[PDB]
Structures are given as structure tokens and as C-alpha cells.
Design an enzyme around this catalytic site. Structure first.
Site, short mmCIF file in Angstrom:
data_model
loop_
_atom_site.label_atom_id
_atom_site.label_comp_id
_atom_site.label_asym_id
_atom_site.label_seq_id
_atom_site.Cartn_x
_atom_site.Cartn_y
_atom_site.Cartn_z
N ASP A 35 47.78 53.48 52.07
CA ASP A 35 48.03 54.90 52.23
C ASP A 35 49.52 55.14 52.49
O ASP A 35 50.11 54.52 53.38
CB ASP A 35 47.19 55.46 53.38
N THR A 58 51.74 63.68 48.90
CA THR A 58 52.71 63.51 49.98
C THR A 58 53.91 62.70 49.52
O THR A 58 55.06 63.10 49.73
CB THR A 58 52.04 62.84 51.19
N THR A 59 53.66 61.56 48.87
CA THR A 59 54.75 60.74 48.36
C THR A 59 55.39 61.35 47.12
O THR A 59 56.51 60.96 46.76
CB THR A 59 54.25 59.33 48.04
N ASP A 84 38.90 66.30 52.92
CA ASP A 84 39.91 66.19 51.87
C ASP A 84 39.36 66.64 50.53
O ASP A 84 40.12 67.11 49.67
CB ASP A 84 40.43 64.76 51.79
#
Lengths: 71, 190, 63, 140, 487, 50
Positions: free
Chosen positions: E44, E77-78, E355
Site C-alpha cells: 500500500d 493517492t500516489t 472504499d
């Protein structure tokens, strides 16, 4: 040197293959000549460069080029 | 203008696996060697079990940490093959490290193992042989029980413990569906 | 320690110059902000130059 | 005790002494070459998996001082004659004599549950070591 | 001086250097070395960044901005850090060697962000939000490679029932129009209930409580129980005072009594003859949801309790035991009840369902889909080269550098694919001109193919918030040209 | 046998094309040429990569 930039970039997308990366960088290497002329003359780098592109790039409704390409 | 080609790096992670493999390489098999490990306890202990060897030594290298966790999962489920798995992980990295300079991508290396694993299950079903639940297999269980015994001893003690280990399971457990519990068998040390 | 003459006068000018060069970026609304990090490691982001000099740690009599 | 406990739980048994590792490494090599249904680039890494399964029979003869290449050619010569005939005969490495042996007569057998989780277990452990490009040192 | 501006780009590159191979479904596993001897093998991206110890202060700003996007959406996010990190790399020689003013670069990114959002709206495709089968392949991005892959068929029905229940159009131009007006926080909040089965799990609408009956002999079947809410419990503020507080509630003769705090044994005998059940141990946070599913006005003093309370719309009183524990079923809100064979299974479904519904709302908010697998990132870079020639200004140089950063996301998936990045990016760029941006990248195979077959699509709001935060994160690093220390 | 395969991998390495892809296309082409009952020579093209 500035006028040839428009002709080199036109042949970049026309020729398929990996040569597209070398053709685009081939026209960028010609931008050093006008940049050194502005630095030695005391002119700003942010001034002469955008004025040269806007002078040689215009929208003319016709095939024959007009105005002045001698700038 | 800072950008790189992402150099291979890796290396020592496989190199540290080769040094750990040689520790358990000579410790596997009935003809292997028995090594002595004493850390801080002043108590001489000699065992070839791969899980016990890793728990009795403090390893600062992060590579052997994942290998140490693999022996804990095989002991609580399979209960055997702790050393064999360690030898397969280290040797597989040796053949995979040579392909790194060739340009082989590690994801395909991981994906190529899953394809060979699924194809191995087809050959595994045809290669295995089913054994009957009949109680007349005690003669056949004698040769099977010696497989695990000959590994941890010099083979002279196996002949003594052969009737003891074989008759230990059959006496406590009658033959039915039921289940088996190893805690019901007491162990006395003298 | 006691230092007199023109040696201490030049050090007071360079000290105020180093402090002044830090706040020249925040002058005017088009100016640039800055981050002030303490020994704890936290920081803040603000364009107001008044709160910068209060939270800025500088050891100097003219500072 | 834990080895015999798996005999009563699971009715399937596998012979030891490298009989399963040699037969599996040889089968997987000629299986993908005939079908050719995976990929041309994928089969490059598959060959490394077949060569990694032959270290077990080479390790048993390495501690005793025997030539691992000599005992390897003797097993492959016996497996070639078994492919022509329609019968089924298992071949294994005998450490005492040095030649091949029949694992059914010698009585060397390994549990099915131990060897089933050994291939799948070692697959995920050896894979994660190659997935880390750069060591991450943080926390202090 | 100029050294602080270099450290800002270097600090942004050091943070993104770890997540370079963490982008995409093919992301590999990372090993984090702790000073105590522990290791973290999770792949993650945002879970590792919280444990990374950093020095330069700009690295802490990237961690706080990634935490905000992690709460809103589960993925991407990344993506924001890599997209914003490559902008400073292409603009590094422009800020130093070319001597370009930083605000000009910041102002160019603001104008490029407006044109980038216009291209995203053009490449988007319409999607039906009421189709239950169309939402299966969408939410599947947060489903597959997880334990819920087997129950995914039943998981899609549980997520859509909760979103469609709490959404209200209320379209008009007067007070402003929220699209479907979804509230995830209060209404979609999930409480794990032990025992049961996942296949039989249904979406309950109401408030659920696990407390049992406080009296040994009581009727287990009530026709229409009426919920009565109160603040101060029944006790001495001695026998008449407790009974006097009950007479104020019994004035309407309720068949059900729910007390927030505990109930003493003295008050149980007074309410026993009244034909009403006594229920104590009720949390305060759930009291707001009870008033909305019932309508009983919350009142502090018992003497001020209004008679306007109603017990209507109560499904069943059945106390029947489920999972060796007595439950209560009261089924503008809903309560998702996750039933399973153990607590460890329900704990993983919890975060997975939250999620999954977050991605589900992402499709509900914006009724449009964008191509994934680097197709959207490459299609925008093609439009940036065409609009760069019509600008005719000093901003043209930093504007063309954006197209180089837009192509880093599809190049990232190629670095994990194993093929030649230069050979694939050259052919992939030409396929978007005559292919109507239908040419994506296949992760499993690695050969460039169209996305019409596999049908990989992602909602637009994720793509919009990804490019919007990246510009705000990249410009914020350029806003600070000097760093000082001390309290 | 493996020592003779470095020459076709060396020629393609300087060109930038993946030496793993050119090796698979040649081996797969020679297998189909034997079953077609003909003689066809195969070589490595450095410009195109196939």
C-alpha cells in the site's frame, strides 16, 4: 533559425517511428543562437524569445505567406 | 535536470540468501551435517530443523526475516519441510539474478511462477498415489516413519525408535473419522 | 568578549542584511511566502509578514 | 509424529529422495514446449523454475561427496526408457549405493500436504524478495 | 538564495521516488526497515508514507496533502504525487538555467489546469447511474485482488442500496443543486454485527441495537412499539420520585421505553404493569439517528416530553437470537448490517465496503467515465501540444513542460510491464489522434490494445481531483523560496 | 549453444530494441517453417526490430 523551427516540427509528426523524438529536439537546438544574441546585447531572455515566435507565426487565410518573414 | 534510468540495485538481497542457503544446505537430508548453535544460554543444542536454527540466532539482515516467517507458517500447517523450502527460495534467486542483466522484468518472473504452479497441480494429481485407511498398513508405515527419523540422527537410533513411533499413533487412536491430538501423548525427559 | 572598531560595524550590517534578505520575498501581495520550522519540526504557511518576524528566531541585538 | 499425523488425515502419499522434484522438473520443461500456449517471453523465466527444483537431489549427493552431475545423468537415462513403455515406474536417487533406486521398494515417502504447500509457499516468498527495487530505511 | 528552491524540488523527488513503482495494479511490494528490527511488506502506497521519516520540511507537506486525498477516495493517492513531482523535474532547468520567474510558472499551471479540465470533460463518456450491472465492473476496481472477490456479486447489491436510499435530487436553480446529495458520514456509517452469513446480508433502514431485555419475563412480540427518547434516566434526582417520572411518560401509554443511560431495578416494576419494554444502555451519538427514523422529539426533562412522538413505521419487535446474542431490528437513512462467519472476516469487509462505496459515489456524483490505464493521462498530453502553439507568450515554455509530465503516468505502467518504454510511448501517442482516445494499455499482457474490449473505465471526479490537487501541490512548493529554522 | 546466441542479442542491444522479444519471434518462426515443408532463412532486422 526561428523560421526553420516551424518546418522541422511539421515533419516530426509526419514521419512515424522513434525518429519523432530526435526531430523535435533537433529544432530546439537552434534556439540557442537567438538566446545568446539577447544575452550579449543586455536584453532579457523572457523578452526577445516570445516576440520572435509571435512574429513568424500568424493566421493568414491563404496559401501564400504574407507580412514579413525577415524579422 | 535530474532523471535516472533506475539502476537494477537488488544484489545483496540475493547474496544474503546464498549465505543463508549454505547454512541449511548441509543440514538437509539424512546424510547431512549436524551443526551446534548456542546463543547466550550456555546450553549445547544440536538440531537440523530449519525453523529452530533461525529462531536461535539474531539476524540483522532484512532478507532472512521473510525466510524466518515462512518457516513459522509451514510448521503450524504442514509441520515439515522447513529446510527444504529455504533451499528452494535461495536457489531460485540464483537463476533469477542472472536474468536481471538480460533485462527480464521481475513481474513476469513472478507471473511465470504462477503459470508453472497451476500446471504443476495437474501433474501433481496424476503423480500422487492414494493410500487405504486399512490398519494393515503398519508394515508400510515402518518405512514411511523412517523418512523423518533418519534425517535428525546418525541412523543408529532410528532402528530403536522405529517400533516406538509407529505403535504410538495406532495405540492411542482407533481407526475412525474422528481426529488426532498430539497433546494427549505425554513426553518425559530423563 | 569585547570587539570595537570597524570590524563590529561591518558585522552588524551583514547581520541585518541577512535578516532583510529573508523578508524581501514576502513584500507585496504578489510576494512569496515562507515556512518557519522550529526544533519540534512543525511549520506553518502564511503570506503575512507581520507574524513572520514574531515567530522567527534570530539572536542579535538589532534583530 | 507430525509426519505420521498427515498420513491418517490425507490418503495421498508422494515418494521422496528427489523422486518428485526430478519428475516435476522434467515434465514442466517438455510440457510448455509442446503446447506453446503461454508466451515466448514467459517461458524464459519458466526454465529457471525447472532448474531450481533439481538442487534437492544435487544437495543430498553433495554432502556425501558424490558427483551431482554423475547421479543426474543416471536418473535421466532411466526415465527415457520409461517414456517408451506404457507402464509406470518411479526413479529416485540412492545415497548409499550411489545409483538409482525404486522409491516403492526402498520405502521413502513424503507427505502430500507438506509438499503441496512447499511449492506454493516458496513461490510467494521468493517472489517478494525480487519485488523490492530499493531498500527503505526510515522510522528514525 | 537559489539553494532553497533546489531543495524543494529535491525533497519532492525523494518522496515520489518510493511510489514510482507503487502506481497501478501491478505495483510491487516494498520493504521498510525499522530501527527496532521490524519490516513492513505491505504494498500500500499511502500506508508506507506515514511511517517514512523525512528531514526537509517540504516532504512533510506532501504527506499531509496525501492524507487528505486518502480520506476522500481510496485510490489515486500516489497518482497526485507522481504527477506533481514530475512537473518540478521538467521545470527545473526552466527556473534556473532559463531564469523564468516562478509566478509565471505558477500562473501557467493555473491556465493549464483550466484547459486540462476541459479536455477531461470532452473525453468522458456517459454512463447510467441506475444500472446495477454497469456498477459491477466499476466498483470491481476496489473489489478484485481482495477476499470479497467471491462475494462481489452480493457486495454490489449492498453498496447500491445504501447510496440510492440517501440520495435526493432536489433539482432547482433557486438555492443551488447538489447532484444526488449523498451523505457518507452520518447515513452510510456501517456497524459490524457478528454472526450470520454474507450471502444473506441485506441493507437495513433504521437504527439497530444489540442490547437485550432487562426483565426476565416480558412479551417477545409487540404489535406497534413506540420509541420514546429521554436524556436523564429513571432514578432519584425516593420511590415516588421514580414513579412520578414514569407517569409523565405513561400519560400517552407507550408500548416501548428506550432510556439512554442505565435503568435501576426500582423503575422496572413501575413500567412493568404499563405494558412497555425497558431498554437501557443507548449511546448518545445514535440518538440523532433514532429521532430521524422515528420522530420522537428529544427532550431533557421528562416533564417537558411532548406528545407529538409517533411509533409509526416500525417493522418488527422480534427479539429472536442471532449469533448467540439478542438483537433488535427497527428496519432518510440506512444501517448496513454486515453478517459473516467470524469477526476477522467482517473487519476486512468493513474497510473494503467503505472504499467500495466511496468509489460508488464517485460514479454517482459525476455521471461520466474516463479511460484508465494511462489512456486519460496520454490523451490530455496530446491536446496540450495543439493549444501550445496558439498561446504566443512567455507561458508557452512552462506550458509545454506539462505534456512531458502527463506522459509519465502511462510510462510508469510500462516500467512495470517490462517492455521498451521509448518504443511503446512513440506508437501509443499516434493511436489517440485517429483512434478517438480508445487506445489504452493492458497490464496483464503488456501489448498496446484498445480499451473497448476489456472496458476499463473510471469516474471523472477522481481524474479531476487528481490533476487539481497536483497543481496545488506543485505550486505550493514553488511558493516558498526560502526556509529558516528556529522557534 | 548458449554462447552462440550472444551475437544476435548483442546486435539488437545496441539498437535499443528488447533482445527478449526478437529471440521469441525467431524461435516461433522456425517451428512453423518445418511443419510447412519448405526452406526459409530467418535473420535479425536491426532497424525494424522483427
Amino acid at each position: 533559425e526561428i523560421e526553420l523551427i516551424s518546418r522541422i516540427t511539421k515533419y516530426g509528426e509526419r514521419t512515424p517511428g522513434l525518429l519523432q523524438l530526435a526531430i523535435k529536439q533537433f529544432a530546439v537546438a537552434f534556439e540557442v543562437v537567438p538566446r545568446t544574441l539577447a544575452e550579449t546585447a543586455g536584453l532579457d531572455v523572457n523578452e526577445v524569445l516570445p516576440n520572435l515566435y509571435a512574429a513568424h507565426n500568424v493566421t493568414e487565410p491563404g496559401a501564400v505567406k504574407t507580412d514579413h518573414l525577415y524579422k | 535536470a535530474e532523471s535516472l534510468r533506475r539502476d537494477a540495485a537488488l544484489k545483496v538481497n540475493v547474496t544474503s540468501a546464498e549465505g543463508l542457503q549454505s547454512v541449511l544446505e548441509t543440514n538437509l537430508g539424512p546424510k547431512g551435517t549436524l551443526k551446534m548453535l548456542v546463543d547466550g544460554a550456555g546450553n549445547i543444542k544440536l538440531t537440523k530443523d530449519g525453523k529452530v536454527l533461525l529462531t536461535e540466532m539474531q539476524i540483522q539482515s532484512p532478507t532472512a526475516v521473510l525466510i524466518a516467517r515462512a518457516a513459522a507458517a509451514q510448521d503450524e500447517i504442514t509441520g515439515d519441510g522447513t529446510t527444504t523450502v529455504v533451499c528452494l527460495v535461495g536457489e531460485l534467486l540464483r537463476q533469477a539474478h542472472r536474468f536481471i542483466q538480460e533485462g527480464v522484468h521481475p513481474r513476469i518472473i513472478t507471473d511465470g511462477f504462477e503459470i508453472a504452479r497451476k500446471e504443476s497441480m495437474k501433474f501433481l494429481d496424476e503423480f500422487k498415489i492414494s493410500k487405504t485407511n486399512l490398519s494393515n498398513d503398519r508394515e508400510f508405515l515402518l518405512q514411511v516413519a523412517r523418512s523423518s527419523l533418519l534425517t535428525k540422527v546418525d541412523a543408529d537410533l532410528t532402528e530403536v525408535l522405529t517400533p516406538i513411533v509407529t505403535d504410538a499413533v495406532l495405540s492411542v487412536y482407533d481407526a475412525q473419522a474422528d481426529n488426532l491430538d498430539l497433546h494427549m501423548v505425554e513426553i518425559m525427559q530423563m | 568578549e569585547k570587539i570595537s572598531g570597524d570590524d563590529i560595524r561591518n558585522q552588524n550590517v551583514l547581520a541585518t542584511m541577512a535578516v532583510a534578505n529573508v523578508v524581501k520575498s514576502s513584500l507585496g501581495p504578489v510576494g512569496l511566502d515562507k515556512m518557519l520550522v522550529d526544533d519540534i519540526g512543525d511549520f506553518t504557511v502564511t503570506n503575512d509578514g507581520a507574524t513572520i518576524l514574531s515567530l522567527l528566531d534570530v539572536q542579535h541585538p538589532a534583530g | 509424529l507430525r509426519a505420521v499425523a498427515n498420513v491418517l488425515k490425507d490418503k495421498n502419499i508422494i515418494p521422496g529422495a528427489g523422486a518428485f522434484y526430478i519428475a516435476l522438473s522434467r515434465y514442466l520443461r517438455s510440457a510448455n514446449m509442446n503446447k506453446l500456449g503461454a508466451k515466448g517471453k514467459t517461458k524464459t523465466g519458466i526454465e529457471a523454475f525447472a532448474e531450481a527444483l533439481l538442487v534437492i537431489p544435487k544437495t543430498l549427493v553433495k554432502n556425501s561427496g558424490f558427483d551431482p552431475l554423475d547421479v543426474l545423468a543416471m536418473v535421466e537415462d532411466e526415465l527415457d526408457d520409461a517414456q517408451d513403455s506404457d507402464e509406470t515406474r518411479y526413479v529416485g536417487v540412492d545415497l548409499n549405493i550411489g545409483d538409482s533406486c525404486d522409491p516403492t521398494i526402498e520405502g521413502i515417502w513424503d507427505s502430500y500436504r507438506v509438499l503441496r504447500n512447499a511449492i506454493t509457499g516458496a513461490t510467494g516468498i521468493a517472489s517478494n524478495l525480487l519485488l523490492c527495487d530499493e531498500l527503505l530505511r526510515a522510522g528514525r | 538564495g537559489r539553494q532553497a528552491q533546489i531543495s524543494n524540488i529535491t525533497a519532492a523527488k525523494a518522496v515520489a521516488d518510493v511510489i514510482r513503482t507503487c502506481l497501478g495494479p501491478k505495483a510491487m511490494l516494498k520493504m521498510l526497515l525499522d530501527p527496532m528490527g521490524g519490516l513492513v511488506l505491505t504494498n500500500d502506497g499511502h500506508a508506507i508514507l506515514r511511517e517514512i521519516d523525512v528531514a526537509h520540511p517540504a516532504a512533510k507537506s506532501m504527506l499531509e496533502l496525501s492524507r487528505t486525498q486518502d480520506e476522500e477516495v481510496g485510490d489515486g493517492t500516489t497518482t497526485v504525487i507522481i504527477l506533481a513531482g514530475e512537473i518540478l523535474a521538467q521545470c527545473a532547468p526552466y527556473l534556473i538555467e532559463k531564469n523564468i520567474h516562478p509566478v509565471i510558472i505558477i500562473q501557467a499551471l493555473k491556465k493549464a489546469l483550466t484547459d486540462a479540465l476541459e479536455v477531461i470533460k470532452q473525453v468522458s463518456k456517459p454512463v447510467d447511474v441506475e444500472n446495477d450491472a454497469a456498477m459491477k465492473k466499476l466498483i470491481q476496481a476496489s473489489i478484485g485482488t481482495k477476499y470479497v472477490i467471491h462475494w462481489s456479486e452480493k457486495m454490489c447489491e449492498l453498496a447500491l442500496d445504501a447510496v440510492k436510499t440517501v440520495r435526493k435530487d432536489l433539482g432547482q436553480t433557486v438555492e443551488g443543486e447538489p447532484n444526488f446529495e449523498i451523505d457518507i458520514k452520518r447515513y452510510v456509517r456501517v456497524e459490524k454485527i457478528p454472526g450470520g452469513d454474507v450471502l444473506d446480508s441485506r441493507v437495513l433502514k433504521g437504527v439497530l441495537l444489540n442490547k437485550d431485555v432487562v426483565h426476565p419475563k416480558m412479551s417477545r412480540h409487540i404489535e406497534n412499539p413506540r420509541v420514546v427518547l429521554l436524556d436523564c434516566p429513571l432514578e432519584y434526582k425516593e420511590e415516588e420520585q421514580v414513579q412520578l417520572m414514569c407517569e409523565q411518560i405513561l400519560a400517552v401509554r407507550p408500548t416501548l421505553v428506550i432510556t439512554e443511560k442505565g435503568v435501576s431495578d426500582l423503575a422496572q416494576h413501575y413500567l412493568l404493569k404499563g405494558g412497555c419494554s425497558v431498554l437501557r444502555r443507548v449511546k448518545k451519538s445514535d440518538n440523532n439517528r433514532i429521532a430521524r427514523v422515528t420522530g420522537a422529539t428529544i427532550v431533557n426533562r421528562v416533564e417537558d416530553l411532548k406528545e407529538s412522538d409517533v411509533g409509526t413505521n416500525c417493522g418488527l419487535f422480534k427479539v429472536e437470537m442471532i449469533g448467540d446474542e439478542y438483537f433488535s431490528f427497527l428496519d432518510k437513512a440506512c444501517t448496513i448490517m454486515l453478517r459473516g462467519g467470524s469477526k476477522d472476516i467482517l473487519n476486512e469487509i468493513d474497510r473494503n465496503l467503505q472504499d467500495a462505496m466511496a468509489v460508488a459515489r464517485n460514479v454517482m456524483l459525476s455521471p461520466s467515465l474516463s479511460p484508465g490505464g494511462g489512456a486519460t493521462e496520454m490523451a490530455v498530453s496530446v491536446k496540450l501540444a495543439e493549444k501550445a502553439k496558439q498561446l504566443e507568450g512567455i507561458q508557452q515554455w512552462p506550458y509545454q513542460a506539462v505534456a512531458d509530465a502527463m506522459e509519465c503516468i502511462p510510462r510508469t505502467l510500462i516500467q512495470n510491464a517490462g517492455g521498451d518504454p521509448i518504443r511503446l510511448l512513440s506508437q501509443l501517442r499516434a493511436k489517440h489522434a485517429q483512434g478517438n482516445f480508445t487506445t489504452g494499455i493492458d497490464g496483464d499482457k503488456g501489448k498496446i490494445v484498445d480499451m473497448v474490449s476489456y472496458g476499463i473505465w473510471e469516474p471523472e471526479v477522481i481524474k479531476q481531483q487528481s490533476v487539481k490537487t497536483a497543481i496545488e501541490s506543485a505550486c505550493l512548493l514553488l511558493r516558498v523560496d526560502d526556509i529558516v529554522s528556529g522557534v
